[PDB]
Amino acid sequence: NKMEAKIDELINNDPVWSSQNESLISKPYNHILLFRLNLIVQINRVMNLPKDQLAIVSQIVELLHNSSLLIDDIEDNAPLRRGQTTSHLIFGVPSTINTANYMYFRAMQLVSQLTTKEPLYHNLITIFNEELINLHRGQGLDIYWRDFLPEIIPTQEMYLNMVMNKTGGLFRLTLRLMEALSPSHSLVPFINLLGIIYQIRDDYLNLKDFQFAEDITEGKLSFPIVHALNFTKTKGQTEQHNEILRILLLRTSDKDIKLKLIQILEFDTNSLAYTKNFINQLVNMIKNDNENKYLP
Amino acid sequence: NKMEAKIDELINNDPVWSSQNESLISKPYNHILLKPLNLIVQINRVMNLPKDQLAIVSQIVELLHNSSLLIDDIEDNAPLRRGQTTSHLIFGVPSTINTANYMYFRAMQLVSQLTTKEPLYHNLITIFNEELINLHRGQGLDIYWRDFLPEIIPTQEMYLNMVMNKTGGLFRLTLRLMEALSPSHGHSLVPFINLLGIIYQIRDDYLNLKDFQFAEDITEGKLSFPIVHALNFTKTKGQTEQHNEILRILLLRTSDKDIKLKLIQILEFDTNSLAYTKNFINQLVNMIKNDNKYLP
Ligand SMILES: CCCCCCCCCCCC(O)(P(=O)(O)O)P(=O)(O)O
Ligand SMILES: CCCCCCCCCCCC(O)(P(=O)(O)O)P(=O)(O)O
Numbered sequence: 305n306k307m308e309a310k311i312d313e314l315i316n317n318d319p320v321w322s323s324q325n326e327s328l329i330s331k332p333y334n335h336i337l338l339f340r341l342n343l344i345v346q347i348n349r350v351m352n353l354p355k356d357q358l359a360i361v362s363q364i365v366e367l368l369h370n371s372s373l374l375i376d377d378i379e380d381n382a383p384l385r386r387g388q389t390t391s392h393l394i395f396g397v398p399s400t401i402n403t404a405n406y407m408y409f410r411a412m413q414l415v416s417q418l419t420t421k422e423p424l425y426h427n428l429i430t431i432f433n434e435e436l437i438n439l440h441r442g443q444g445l446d447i448y449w450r451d452f453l454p455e456i457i458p459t460q461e462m463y464l465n466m467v468m469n470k471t472g473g474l475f476r477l478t479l480r481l482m483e484a485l486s487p488s489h490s491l492v493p494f495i496n497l498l499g500i501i502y503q504i505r506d507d508y509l510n511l512k513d514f515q516f517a518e519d520i521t522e523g524k525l526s527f528p529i530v531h532a533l534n535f536t537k538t539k540g541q542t543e544q545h546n547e548i549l550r551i552l553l554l555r556t557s558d559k560d561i562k563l564k565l566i567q568i569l570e571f572d573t574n575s576l577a578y579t580k581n582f583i584n585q586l587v588n589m590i591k592n593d594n595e596n597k598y599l600p
Numbered sequence: 601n602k603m604e605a606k607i608d609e610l611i612n613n614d615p616v617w618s619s620q621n622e623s624l625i626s627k628p629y630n631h632i633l634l635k636p637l638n639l640i641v642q643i644n645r646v647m648n649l650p651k652d653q654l655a656i657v658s659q660i661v662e663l664l665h666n667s668s669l670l671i672d673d674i675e676d677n678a679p680l681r682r683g684q685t686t687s688h689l690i691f692g693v694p695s696t697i698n699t700a701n702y703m704y705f706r707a708m709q710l711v712s713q714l715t716t717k718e719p720l721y722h723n724l725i726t727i728f729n730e731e732l733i734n735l736h737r738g739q740g741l742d743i744y745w746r747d748f749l750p751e752i753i754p755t756q757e758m759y760l761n762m763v764m765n766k767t768g769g770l771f772r773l774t775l776r777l778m779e780a781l782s783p784s785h786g787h788s789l790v791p792f793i794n795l796l797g798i799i800y801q802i803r804d805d806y807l808n809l810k811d812f813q814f815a816e817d818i819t820e821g822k823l824s825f826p827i828v829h830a831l832n833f834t835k836t837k838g839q840t841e842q843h844n845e846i847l848r849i850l851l852l853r854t855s856d857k858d859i860k861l862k863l864i865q866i867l868e869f870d871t872n873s874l875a876y877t878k879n880f881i882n883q884l885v886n887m888i889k890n891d892n893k894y895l896p
């Protein structure tokens with residue numbers, strides 16, 4: 305009687321979900337909430353999306369970006385993000401994966417509210433879908449090289465294609481949506497370059513700031529490491545090639561060992577100067593773009 | 601200049617992604633595929649989607665389903681799935697999370713193959729988006745309750761709402777896509793599919809213990825339907841010690857067979873949670889068998 309009446313009311317209704325439930329599930333996300341808006345703002349100078357639409361694009365980018373870091377720290381076994389303990393060490397890996405994944409879809413739902421024009425909406429959705437695919441392919445390859453090392457040592461070209469998918473993904477997602485929504489040449493090439501500079505700069509500073517250098521502990525095929533591995537292989541420097549591999553494989557937190565690998569990159573392969581130079585050349589493609597081939 | 605030409609070609613093209621890249625990052629997913637549509641077929645006697653479209657709906661649901669299991673097994677620290685080692689123990693948690701999440705978006709991309717009609721497409725994506733949101737909400741609660749126990753002891757009503765989200769989400773996703781695509785067929789079957797998912801989930805929780813009586817749900821610490829009844833039964837009857845022992849055993853995350861059998865016999869003879877669940881399941885099945893208010 306009563307049990308069946310309760311079941312009947314339950315199945316004839318939408319699933320029950322409270323604001324308290326929403327709060328529980330958002331915990332890992334809120335935790336990470338404690339400049340990208342600047343770049344969005346600056347680009348809108350050209351795009352001129354209305355303010356309320358610009359706010360939704362910005363919320364979408366914030367959700368995806370913050371959620372991708374919660375997942376990334378779990379994938380990279382990172383103890384710290386923004387000078388604070390990572391969410392998965394506080395709320396657990398289970399809750400943090402689910403919460404991050406949940407925000408991907410909340411971000412997806414915000415896309416629908418950018419426009420109700422049916423053609424444009426499909427385009428927006430396709431842009432969101434293609435770049436989420438690219439980000440995962442790039443992340444997938446970066447993780448694969450790290451966890452299967454030393455099965456595959458990527459070349460510089462391979463690394464740059466990985467970065468186009470991995471880092472170019474959110475940059476392109478943001479730009480492509482603003483461009484599709486513009487009431488006003490495509491700035492995608494420029495945003496790709498920006499993304500590449502950004503990622504190499506990141507790999508470079510991880511080592512340079514130390515000289516934590518968590519990238520070494522993580523064992524990732526960073527730009528300076530890819531340079532170092534290919535340089536030693538090409539010069540037939542077997543021992544140095546193997547010592548680089550051994551340290552990355554150690555997944556070490558030992559300061560002295562991390563410093564030893566940085567010494568190999570500074571004195572044997574000169575990979576840090578190689579990378580500094582590479583970043584400058586990339587940046588000069590923008591600084592010397594007098595004809596505004598990339599710049600607006 | 602050769603680097604510039606190289607960088608220029610790179611940023612003015614789509615990110616490069618090979619079929620070999622696709623294979624490498626698909627490993628975690630291919631692994632679960634070596635494991636074993638009829639329900640989809642029955643529903644179609646009512647909906648009458650043509651076979652080629654049905655096949656696409658079925659492909660979308662299998663991708664989401666299989667992907668779900670990869671992540672759920674990480675979240676539940678499961679050692680086995682479909683009689684074999686779980687993907688995360690083989691390829692690592694990092695690649696398994698990324699690949700599974702990657703497939704969520706591949707599934708998303710298949711939605712566009714269901715139709716060329718913009719209005720309809722928009723509705724199919726909304727359904728997809730809504731039930732993925734519901735799935736993560738329910739999963740979020742099941743994990744929170746479990747990992748933070750005894751902070752929250754769910755009531756039967758709370759468990760049923762979590763299930764409407766977590767288990768109902770996939771059943772409704774399939775059915776709602778079919779009802780939207782239906783060229784034809786009576787009242788909506790959502791209520792019925794909601795009830796089917798509840799019966800399915802509780803029967804699941806039930807057999808997990810009954811088959812053992814590996815009862816892996818105990819090792820997991822899951823607030824299953826029989827466990828929710830026992831914890832509420834003991835609190836209501838003043839069985840302080842038994843309430844506390846149930847909590848203690850769940851929090852051990854133990855694989856000891858005798859310890860799991862003790863807990864099951866507490867549910868058998870002390871709280872009568874197994875008989876309660878078996879009768880609850882029967883009443884649900886009878887709500888249908890003794891009904892065309894729900895059925896077609
Ligand atoms: C949109 C959700 C899925 C995103 C999948 C890709 C995430 C890439 C994150 C890369 C983060 C880093 O840039 P970090 O220095 O750790 O912040 P890295 O781990 O690649 O170095
Ligand atoms: C994109 C899909 C995300 C889905 C998130 C929810 C997944 C729920 C999976 C539930 C699996 C189980 O049914 P199992 O018995 O382990 O196969 P349970 O862990 O809930 O018992």
Ligand SMILES: [Mg+2]
Nearest residue numbers: 376377380382
């Ligand atoms: Mg990282």
Ligand SMILES: [Mg+2]
Nearest residue numbers: 376379380446
């Ligand atoms: Mg990473």
Ligand SMILES: [Mg+2]
Nearest residue numbers: 506507510519
């Ligand atoms: Mg980094």
Ligand SMILES: [Mg+2]
Nearest residue numbers: 672673676678
């Ligand atoms: Mg499970």
Ligand SMILES: [Mg+2]
Nearest residue numbers: 672675676742
């Ligand atoms: Mg689970």
Ligand SMILES: [Mg+2]
Nearest residue numbers: 804805808817
């Ligand atoms: Mg189960």
